Design a protein around this ligand. Structure first.
Ligand code: 6CF
Ligand code: MN
Ligand code: MN
Ligand code: MN
Ligand code: MN
Ligand code: MN
Ligand code: MN
Ligand code: MN
Ligand code: NA
Ligand code: NA
Length: 315
DNA sequence: GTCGG
DNA sequence: GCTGATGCGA
DNA sequence: CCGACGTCGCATCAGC
């Protein structure tokens, strides 16, 4: 909260660059600045004090000066009051509608929720589901329900095969008081690098009516919707993602999947330096051959990082 | 947009 | 009908 | 000054 004004404004600029300008790297830049500034222990008194930090350059420094002087930002008010831009930004809030479809809808007059309803015919399945649950998906999931979902998912998985192991990862694993969704890392002895496991887990979860809709399904990833059962006399629908990972790659998998997204980018970068390439599966030398992983701490050892706990990788 | 080369 | 590239998201 | 900037899985539809 300490520097929320700045970071909120950077995050908003980041989103504009992604959704409207379709400039992914500028998106990345603002998010980096925002991340660095959120890790800064002091209260930012000037743009130049900000500019000392890596990721914060000339332009952002100016935008910080204006923000601390005016309380607002000229560039954003423009964006906010601009019909197209404000419209594109709103539409991308629908799961399945990104910068390109949003802009295409808008160019053809489809610019509000109603318009999407008026035009269901023009939405793919995933978009239709994002529409259907637009409200629910924007809600947070308080840890107490996360644990309630955790319990139901491990249980149903056991029921399929006692040798499954499911680790809920994502912000839950970082110990967050609320998460955006449920991310589930799944492994099984039958399946390794050398070696329908996912379909069976999904099918079972569909049968007890936990999973209610499918966004995408493959041999290793399921993206769908779920919902805790309530008193017979309704919980909001939630996004759940299940990843099937080869057992001997669990620790890389769970590193990736625990995040944060920025942690992962800061790690893969700060390992790209040291001659490693970290993906959700392996860690290779600069390239290359998959080194022995045996713990998460194992990955950190390699790239020379003081092992950070999950609750500390939220950047 | 930022920064190392 | 098929499929790469484009899109969207983890 | 310029251009590189993490790394993946699944679905969709143009252009044939
Ligand atoms: N661009 C990305 C996005 C995600 N992830 C990895 C790292 C993430 O930990 C993991 C899940 O991403 P998520 O889409 O469920 C998330 F990010 F929103 P989460 O971290 O879980 O916070 P919450 O969902 O509660 O809002 O995928 C990544 O490596 N790169
Ligand atoms: Mn200091
Ligand atoms: Mn998540
Ligand atoms: Mn997720
Ligand atoms: Mn060991
Ligand atoms: Mn294809
Ligand atoms: Mn340039
Ligand atoms: Mn056609
Ligand atoms: Na979207
Ligand atoms: Na420089």
């Amino acid at each position: 909260t300490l520097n929320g004004g700045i970071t909120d404004m950077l995050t908003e600029l980041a989103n504009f660059e992604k959704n409207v300008s379709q400039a992914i790297h500028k998106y990345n830049a603002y998010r980096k600045a925002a991340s660095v500034i959120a890790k800064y222990p002091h209260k930012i008194k000037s743009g130049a004090e900000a500019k000392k930090l890596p990721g914060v350059g000339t332009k952002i420094a100016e935008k910080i000066d204006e923000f601390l002087a005016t309380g607002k930002l000229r560039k954003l008010e423009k964006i906010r009051q601009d019909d197209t831009s404000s419209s594109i930004n709103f539409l991308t809030r629908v799961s399945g509608i990104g910068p390109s479809a949003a802009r295409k809808f808008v160019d053809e007059g489809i610019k509000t929720l109603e318009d999407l309803r008026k035009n269901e015919d023009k939405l793919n399945h995933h978009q239709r589901i994002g529409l259907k649950y637009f409200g629910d998906f924007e809600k947070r999931i308080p840890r107490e329900e996360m644990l309630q979902m955790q319990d139901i998912v491990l249980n149903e998985v056991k029921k399929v095969d006692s040798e499954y192991i499911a680790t809920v990862c994502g912000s839950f694993r970082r110990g967050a008081e609320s998460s955006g969704d449920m991310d589930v890392l799944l492994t099984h002895p039958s399946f390794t690098s050398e070696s329908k496991l996912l379909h069976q887990v999904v099918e079972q979860l569909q049968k007890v009516h936990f999973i209610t809709d499918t966004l995408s399904k493959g041999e290793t990833k399921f993206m769908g919707v779920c919902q805790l059962p309530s008193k017979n006399d309704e919980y909001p629908h939630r996004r759940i993602d299940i990843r099937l990972i080869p057992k001997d790659q669990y620790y890389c998998g769970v590193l990736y999947f625990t995040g944060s997204d920025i942690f992962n980018k800061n790690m893969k970068a700060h390992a790209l330096e040291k001659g490693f390439t970290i993906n959700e599966y392996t860690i290779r030398p600069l390239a290359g051959e998959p080194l022995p992983v045996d713990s998460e701490k194992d990955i950190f050892d390699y790239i020379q990082w003081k092992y950070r706990e999950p609750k500390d990788r939220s950047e």
